[PDB]
Coordinates of C-alpha atoms in Angstrom, one line a residue:
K1 CA 26.5 0.3 -1.1
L2 CA 24.6 1.2 -4.3
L3 CA 23.2 4.2 -2.4
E4 CA 26.2 6.1 -3.9
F5 CA 24.9 5.3 -7.4
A6 CA 21.3 6.1 -6.4
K7 CA 22.5 9.5 -5.1
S8 CA 24.4 10.4 -8.3
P9 CA 23.5 13.7 -9.9
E10 CA 22.6 12.0 -13.1
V11 CA 20.3 9.4 -11.3
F12 CA 19.0 11.7 -8.5
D13 CA 18.2 14.6 -10.8
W14 CA 16.5 12.2 -13.2
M15 CA 14.4 10.7 -10.3
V16 CA 13.6 14.2 -8.9
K17 CA 12.7 15.2 -12.4
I18 CA 10.2 12.4 -13.0
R19 CA 8.8 12.7 -9.5
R20 CA 7.9 16.4 -10.1
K21 CA 6.2 15.8 -13.5
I22 CA 3.9 13.2 -11.8
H23 CA 3.4 15.5 -8.8
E24 CA 2.3 18.4 -11.2
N25 CA -0.1 16.1 -12.9
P26 CA -1.9 13.9 -10.3
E27 CA -4.1 11.2 -11.9
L28 CA -6.8 9.3 -10.1
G29 CA -7.4 5.5 -9.9
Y30 CA -7.6 3.7 -13.3
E31 CA -7.1 7.1 -15.1
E32 CA -3.3 7.3 -14.7
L33 CA -2.6 7.5 -18.5
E34 CA 0.1 10.1 -18.4
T35 CA 1.8 8.5 -15.3
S36 CA 1.6 5.1 -17.1
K37 CA 3.0 6.5 -20.4
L38 CA 6.0 8.1 -18.5
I39 CA 6.8 4.8 -16.6
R40 CA 6.7 2.9 -19.9
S41 CA 9.0 5.5 -21.6
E42 CA 11.5 5.3 -18.8
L43 CA 11.6 1.5 -18.9
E44 CA 12.1 1.8 -22.6
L45 CA 14.9 4.2 -22.1
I46 CA 16.6 2.2 -19.4
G47 CA 16.3 -1.0 -21.4
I48 CA 13.6 -3.0 -19.7
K49 CA 10.9 -5.2 -21.3
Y50 CA 7.4 -4.9 -19.8
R51 CA 3.8 -6.2 -20.0
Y52 CA 1.0 -3.6 -20.6
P53 CA -1.8 -3.0 -20.0
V54 CA -2.4 -4.7 -16.6
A55 CA -5.5 -3.4 -14.7
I56 CA -6.0 -0.7 -17.4
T57 CA -3.1 1.5 -16.6
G58 CA -0.7 -0.9 -14.8
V59 CA 2.7 -1.9 -16.0
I60 CA 4.9 -4.9 -15.1
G61 CA 8.6 -4.7 -16.1
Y62 CA 11.4 -7.3 -16.0
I63 CA 15.1 -7.2 -15.1
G64 CA 17.4 -10.2 -15.0
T65 CA 17.8 -13.6 -16.7
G66 CA 14.1 -13.7 -17.8
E67 CA 13.8 -17.0 -15.9
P68 CA 12.7 -17.9 -12.3
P69 CA 13.1 -17.1 -9.5
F70 CA 10.8 -14.1 -9.9
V71 CA 10.8 -11.5 -7.2
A72 CA 8.5 -8.4 -7.4
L73 CA 8.9 -4.8 -6.3
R74 CA 5.7 -2.7 -6.1
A75 CA 4.7 1.0 -6.3
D76 CA 1.3 2.7 -6.4
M77 CA 0.4 5.3 -9.2
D78 CA -2.7 7.2 -8.2
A79 CA -3.4 10.6 -6.5
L80 CA -6.3 11.8 -4.5
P81 CA -9.0 14.4 -5.1
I82 CA -7.5 16.9 -2.6
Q83 CA -6.5 20.5 -3.4
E84 CA -2.8 20.9 -2.8
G85 CA -2.2 23.6 -0.2
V86 CA 1.6 23.6 -0.7
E87 CA 2.6 26.7 -2.7
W88 CA 5.7 25.8 -4.8
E89 CA 6.9 25.6 -8.4
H90 CA 5.9 21.9 -8.8
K91 CA 2.5 22.1 -7.1
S92 CA -0.3 20.2 -8.8
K93 CA -1.4 22.0 -12.0
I94 CA -4.7 20.0 -11.8
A95 CA -7.1 21.8 -9.4
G96 CA -8.7 19.5 -6.8
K97 CA -6.2 16.7 -7.1
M98 CA -2.9 16.1 -5.3
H99 CA -0.3 13.4 -4.7
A100 CA -0.7 13.8 -1.0
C101 CA 0.2 10.1 -0.4
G102 CA 3.8 9.8 -1.5
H103 CA 2.9 7.5 -4.4
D104 CA 4.7 10.0 -6.6
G105 CA 7.9 9.1 -4.6
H106 CA 6.8 5.5 -5.0
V107 CA 6.5 5.4 -8.8
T108 CA 9.6 7.5 -8.7
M109 CA 11.8 5.3 -6.5
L110 CA 10.5 2.3 -8.5
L111 CA 11.7 3.8 -11.8
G112 CA 14.9 4.6 -10.0
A113 CA 15.3 1.0 -8.9
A114 CA 14.4 -0.1 -12.4
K115 CA 17.1 2.2 -13.8
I116 CA 19.8 1.0 -11.4
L117 CA 18.9 -2.7 -11.4
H118 CA 19.3 -2.6 -15.1
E119 CA 22.8 -1.4 -14.6
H120 CA 23.7 -4.8 -13.1
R121 CA 21.2 -7.0 -15.0
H122 CA 23.5 -9.8 -16.1
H123 CA 24.4 -10.4 -12.4
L124 CA 20.8 -11.0 -11.3
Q125 CA 20.2 -14.7 -10.4
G126 CA 16.6 -14.6 -11.6
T127 CA 14.1 -11.9 -12.7
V128 CA 13.1 -8.8 -10.8
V129 CA 9.5 -8.0 -11.6
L130 CA 8.4 -4.3 -11.4
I131 CA 4.8 -3.7 -10.7
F132 CA 3.3 -0.3 -11.3
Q133 CA -0.1 -0.6 -9.7
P134 CA -3.1 1.6 -10.4
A135 CA -5.9 2.7 -8.0
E136 CA -4.5 1.8 -4.7
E137 CA -6.7 4.5 -2.9
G138 CA -10.0 2.8 -3.9
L139 CA -8.4 -0.4 -2.6
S140 CA -9.3 -2.2 -5.8
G141 CA -6.1 -2.0 -7.9
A142 CA -3.9 -4.6 -6.3
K143 CA -6.7 -7.1 -6.4
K144 CA -7.4 -6.4 -10.1
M145 CA -3.8 -6.9 -11.1
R146 CA -3.8 -10.2 -9.1
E147 CA -7.0 -11.2 -11.0
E148 CA -5.0 -10.6 -14.2
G149 CA -2.2 -12.9 -13.2
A150 CA 0.3 -10.3 -12.0
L151 CA 1.3 -12.7 -9.2
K152 CA 1.8 -15.9 -11.3
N153 CA 5.2 -17.5 -10.9
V154 CA 6.2 -14.7 -8.5
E155 CA 7.4 -16.0 -5.1
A156 CA 8.1 -12.9 -3.0
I157 CA 7.1 -9.2 -3.3
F158 CA 8.3 -6.1 -1.6
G159 CA 6.7 -2.7 -1.3
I160 CA 7.8 0.7 0.2
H161 CA 5.6 3.5 1.5
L162 CA 7.1 6.9 2.5
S163 CA 6.1 8.0 6.0
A164 CA 5.9 11.3 7.9
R165 CA 5.6 9.2 11.1
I166 CA 9.2 7.7 10.7
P167 CA 12.4 9.7 11.0
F168 CA 14.0 10.7 7.7
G169 CA 16.0 8.0 6.0
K170 CA 14.8 5.1 8.2
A171 CA 12.9 2.1 6.8
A172 CA 10.2 0.7 9.1
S173 CA 8.5 -2.7 9.1
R174 CA 7.8 -5.6 11.5
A175 CA 7.3 -9.4 11.2
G176 CA 3.7 -10.7 10.7
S177 CA 0.5 -8.8 11.3
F178 CA 1.3 -5.2 10.4
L179 CA -1.5 -3.3 8.8
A180 CA -5.1 -3.7 9.7
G181 CA -7.6 -5.4 7.5
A182 CA -11.0 -3.9 6.7
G183 CA -14.5 -5.1 5.8
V184 CA -18.0 -3.9 5.6
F185 CA -21.4 -5.5 6.5
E186 CA -25.0 -4.7 5.7
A187 CA -28.0 -5.6 7.8
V188 CA -31.8 -5.2 7.2
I189 CA -34.0 -5.2 10.3
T190 CA -37.7 -5.8 9.4
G191 CA -40.6 -6.7 11.7
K192 CA -41.7 -10.3 11.6
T193 CA -44.7 -2.3 14.9
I194 CA -42.0 -0.1 16.5
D195 CA -39.8 -3.1 17.2
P196 CA -37.7 -2.7 14.1
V197 CA -36.6 0.7 15.4
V198 CA -36.2 -0.7 18.9
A199 CA -34.1 -3.5 17.4
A200 CA -32.0 -1.1 15.3
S201 CA -30.9 1.3 18.0
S202 CA -30.3 -1.8 20.2
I203 CA -28.1 -3.5 17.6
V204 CA -26.2 -0.2 17.1
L205 CA -25.1 0.2 20.7
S206 CA -24.5 -3.5 20.9
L207 CA -22.1 -3.4 17.9
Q208 CA -20.4 -0.2 19.0
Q209 CA -19.6 -2.1 22.1
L210 CA -17.2 -4.5 20.3
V211 CA -14.9 -1.6 19.6
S212 CA -12.0 -1.6 22.1
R213 CA -8.4 -1.0 23.0
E214 CA -6.1 -3.2 25.1
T215 CA -2.5 -3.3 26.1
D216 CA -1.3 -4.8 22.8
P217 CA -1.9 -2.6 19.8
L218 CA -2.5 -5.8 17.7
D219 CA -5.6 -6.7 19.7
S220 CA -7.5 -3.5 18.6
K221 CA -10.8 -4.2 17.0
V222 CA -13.4 -1.7 15.9
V223 CA -16.8 -1.8 14.3
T224 CA -18.3 1.5 13.0
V225 CA -22.0 1.9 12.2
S226 CA -22.2 4.6 9.5
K227 CA -25.4 3.8 7.7
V228 CA -28.9 3.6 9.3
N229 CA -32.3 4.5 7.8
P230 CA -40.9 2.2 9.9
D231 CA -41.2 -1.2 8.3
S232 CA -37.5 -1.8 7.6
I233 CA -34.2 -0.2 8.6
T234 CA -30.9 -0.7 6.8
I235 CA -27.7 -0.5 8.9
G236 CA -24.4 -0.2 7.1
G237 CA -21.3 -0.9 9.1
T238 CA -17.6 -1.5 8.9
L239 CA -15.1 -3.6 10.9
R240 CA -11.4 -3.7 11.3
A241 CA -8.8 -6.0 13.1
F242 CA -5.1 -6.8 12.8
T243 CA -5.8 -10.4 13.9
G244 CA -8.9 -12.6 14.3
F245 CA -10.7 -10.7 11.5
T246 CA -12.9 -13.6 10.6
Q247 CA -13.9 -14.1 14.2
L248 CA -14.9 -10.4 14.3
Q249 CA -16.9 -10.7 11.2
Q250 CA -18.9 -13.6 12.7
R251 CA -19.3 -11.6 15.9
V252 CA -20.8 -8.7 14.1
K253 CA -23.2 -11.1 12.3
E254 CA -24.1 -13.0 15.4
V255 CA -24.9 -9.9 17.4
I256 CA -27.1 -8.3 14.8
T257 CA -29.0 -11.6 14.3
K258 CA -29.6 -12.4 18.0
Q259 CA -30.3 -8.7 18.9
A260 CA -32.9 -8.8 16.1
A261 CA -34.4 -12.1 17.1
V262 CA -35.0 -11.2 20.8
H263 CA -36.9 -8.2 19.4
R264 CA -39.1 -10.3 17.2
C265 CA -37.5 -9.1 14.0
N266 CA -36.2 -10.6 10.7
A267 CA -32.4 -10.2 10.3
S268 CA -30.7 -9.9 7.0
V269 CA -26.9 -9.5 7.3
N270 CA -24.4 -9.4 4.4
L271 CA -20.6 -9.3 5.0
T272 CA -19.7 -8.6 1.4
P273 CA -22.4 -6.1 0.4
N274 CA -22.5 -5.0 -3.2
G275 CA -19.3 -6.9 -4.0
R276 CA -17.4 -5.2 -1.2
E277 CA -15.1 -8.1 -0.4
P278 CA -13.0 -7.9 2.8
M279 CA -9.4 -6.9 2.7
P280 CA -7.3 -9.0 5.1
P281 CA -4.7 -7.5 7.4
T282 CA -1.2 -6.9 5.7
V283 CA 1.1 -9.6 6.9
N284 CA 4.9 -9.3 6.6
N285 CA 6.4 -12.7 5.9
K286 CA 9.0 -13.4 8.6
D287 CA 11.7 -14.6 6.2
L288 CA 11.3 -11.4 4.0
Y289 CA 11.3 -9.3 7.1
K290 CA 14.3 -11.1 8.5
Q291 CA 16.1 -10.6 5.1
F292 CA 14.9 -7.0 4.8
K293 CA 16.4 -6.0 8.2
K294 CA 19.8 -7.0 6.9
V295 CA 19.5 -5.1 3.6
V296 CA 18.6 -1.9 5.6
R297 CA 21.3 -2.3 8.1
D298 CA 24.0 -3.1 5.5
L299 CA 22.9 -0.1 3.4
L300 CA 22.0 2.7 5.8
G301 CA 23.3 1.8 9.3
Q302 CA 22.9 -0.3 12.4
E303 CA 20.5 2.4 13.6
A304 CA 18.3 3.0 10.6
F305 CA 16.1 -0.1 11.1
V306 CA 12.9 1.2 12.7
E307 CA 10.6 -1.6 14.1
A308 CA 7.1 -0.5 13.0
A309 CA 4.0 -0.4 15.1
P310 CA 0.8 -2.0 13.9
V311 CA -1.2 0.6 12.0
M312 CA -5.0 0.8 11.3
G313 CA -4.5 2.3 7.8
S314 CA -5.6 1.4 4.3
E315 CA -3.2 -0.3 1.9
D316 CA -4.4 -2.8 -0.7
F317 CA -0.9 -4.3 -0.9
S318 CA -2.4 -6.9 1.5
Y319 CA -4.1 -8.6 -1.5
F320 CA -0.5 -9.5 -2.7
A321 CA 1.2 -10.6 0.6
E322 CA -1.6 -12.9 1.4
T323 CA -1.4 -14.7 -2.0
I324 CA 2.5 -14.8 -2.0
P325 CA 5.1 -14.0 0.6
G326 CA 5.0 -10.2 1.0
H327 CA 6.9 -7.5 2.8
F328 CA 5.6 -4.0 3.2
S329 CA 7.8 -1.2 4.7
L330 CA 7.6 2.5 5.4
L331 CA 10.3 4.9 4.3
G332 CA 11.0 7.9 6.6
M333 CA 10.7 11.5 5.7
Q334 CA 10.0 13.3 9.1
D335 CA 12.5 15.9 10.3
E336 CA 13.4 17.0 13.8
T337 CA 10.5 19.3 14.4
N338 CA 7.8 17.5 12.6
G339 CA 7.5 20.0 9.8
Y340 CA 6.5 17.3 7.3
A341 CA 2.7 17.0 7.1
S342 CA 1.0 13.6 7.6
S343 CA 0.0 11.7 4.5
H344 CA -3.6 12.5 3.3
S345 CA -3.4 16.3 3.7
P346 CA -3.4 19.3 1.5
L347 CA 0.1 20.2 2.9
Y348 CA 1.8 16.7 2.6
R349 CA 5.5 16.7 1.8
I350 CA 8.1 14.1 0.7
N351 CA 11.6 15.3 1.3
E352 CA 12.8 14.9 -2.3
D353 CA 16.1 13.7 -1.0
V354 CA 14.5 10.4 0.1
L355 CA 14.2 9.1 -3.5
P356 CA 17.7 7.6 -3.6
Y357 CA 17.2 5.8 -0.2
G358 CA 14.1 3.9 -1.5
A359 CA 15.6 3.4 -5.0
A360 CA 18.7 1.7 -3.4
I361 CA 16.5 -0.2 -0.9
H362 CA 14.3 -1.4 -3.8
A363 CA 17.2 -2.3 -6.0
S364 CA 19.2 -3.9 -3.2
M365 CA 16.4 -5.9 -1.8
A366 CA 15.8 -7.6 -5.1
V367 CA 19.4 -8.5 -5.5
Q368 CA 20.1 -9.9 -2.0
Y369 CA 16.9 -11.9 -2.2
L370 CA 17.9 -13.6 -5.4
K371 CA 21.6 -13.8 -4.3
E372 CA 20.2 -15.6 -1.3
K373 CA 17.6 -17.9 -2.9
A374 CA 20.5 -19.2 -5.0
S375 CA 22.8 -19.8 -2.0

């Protein structure tokens, strides 16, 4: 019922205040200096110790006993090089950049949560870890924080992402496979005269075939050939799946290889070209999802819980929920007539009145988890 606190003029105004400053000054991946300085100042003001730097601009705060169990809450920090088309007082003052992906609401609701949780810190049966992650858009920030030990000793992490595809004030998630993974591959087709070209256009159609839709949105698999360019032809492609990703990677390789061989050609295929490691699908741990549904129902209502549909989007949170139990949820903003623009657009819009919902959900989820682990 801490939503009442989260909605307080003092707290809500403070949250809306910080959200706007970040919104007016969008910073790109790994260059979120000002966003990072603000987060650190608010943690300082609230009364929360933190580790900095992590992944250049990242910050990790602590609330509780200081001892295990450790549970983490995560928010992204970076904007995108998009010109804000929304005309308003708090529009980005940085031309060509915009927080058109809600992250502003994310850092915001994470500082909210930090502020609130601190209010009840001596009651926490463990330590809530607050992760302020840089460069989510380029899908390399979560992995970099992991490399730097951000996940050590931590046993369960929760993340929230505002959504224009979910009704306002409803949190949406599902158990297990939720967000699609993504990988790339590179192939070089060289003649062991025109065969290489014959082989290349063949392989292309043959890989484009693999893409398909079925009756379960979790079975969707796609392979996109984007690069192709005669002694040798380089073919750069991508692949995505919610399940059986490894089996799809091998299929892409097998096809290119055999389709090259029957055309008397050499086949060079790389599934991690230039250090582009695959990003596995985002999997929501059943226990966290099961616990999460309760937190949402107890807080908002028996009807707020929105069972999410598998999505083929991009969210590097998966590098966390694969290494430790993870739970990723959406937070609704959409109104009755769909006036709220979809994420990734010059017109994107968070309804600023959603901040207390995620702040409470963030705060609450960390408490119930700990107050459950100790049961």
